[PDB]
Amino acid sequence: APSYRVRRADISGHGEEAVVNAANAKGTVSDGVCRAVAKKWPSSFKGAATPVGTAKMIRADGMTVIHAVGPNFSTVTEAEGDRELAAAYRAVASIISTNNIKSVAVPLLSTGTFSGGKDRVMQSLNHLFTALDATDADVVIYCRDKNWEKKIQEAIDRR
Numbered sequence: 777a778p779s780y781r782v783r784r785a786d787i788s789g790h791g792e793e794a795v796v797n798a799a800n801a802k803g804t805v806s807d808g809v810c811r812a813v814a815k816k817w818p819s820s821f822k823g824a825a826t827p828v829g830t831a832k833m834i835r836a837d838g839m840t841v842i843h844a845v846g847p848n849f850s851t852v853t854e855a856e857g858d859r860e861l862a863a864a865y866r867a868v869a870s871i872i873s874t875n876n877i878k879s880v881a882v883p884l885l886s887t888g889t890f891s892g893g894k895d896r897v898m899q900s901l902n903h904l905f906t907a908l909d910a911t912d913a914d915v916v917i918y919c920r921d922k923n924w925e926k927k928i929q930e931a932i933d934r935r
């Protein structure tokens with residue numbers, strides 16, 4: 777069974793075997809988790825473009841980077857975005873299990889740039905749990921907000 781922890785830290789400083797980038801479909805560097813991943817593992821972005829609701833893995837810069845593209849909730853209906861967000865996390869879980877990845881640092885997809893201005897911490901976290909429950913990986917969830925950290929810890933504890 778997987779284990780879940782939360783850290784309030786820059787995800788570029790993670791101590792796991794792999795890191796999930798909250799990516800865009802075009803594989804461009806812009807504000808958010810992506811900028812931190814690009815600074816620490818710059819060559820991880822080569823050929824990283826992948827459609828919304830999918831993930832694409834690369835080994836670069838001594839790191840396994842998994843580019844996962846959550847939906848932009850400004851560009852889909854709520855129900856369409858919920859389906860696509862579930863799909864992005866399942867694509868992450870499939871890459872973790874098929875590549876024997878033992879531990880992974882994960883940000884909450886679609887909770888920042890792609891949130892459509894809504895609080896989606898619980899929506900994103902519930903899809904993260906449902907998908908990564910299919911793996912045996914140690915999962916470390918990364919956030920920057922003290923209230924998010926507590927919410928996430930509370931949700932981990934309830935389990």
Ligand SMILES: Nc1ncnc2c1ncn2[C@@H]1O[C@H](COP(=O)(O)OP(=O)(O)OC[C@@H](O)[C@@H](O)[C@@H](O)CO)[C@@H](O)[C@H]1O
Pocket residue numbers: 785786787788797798799800804805806807808809810811812846883884885886887888889890891918919920
């Ligand atoms: N360094 C950091 N360490 C830990 N947590 C971090 C972080 N930088 C941002 N976060 C948080 O990670 C979540 C995803 O944000 P993001 O805004 O990065 O994630 P999405 O909402 O999925 O949007 C993706 C787009 O930003 C896309 O264009 C990419 O270029 C960018 O990622 C948000 O809750 C952010 O507050």
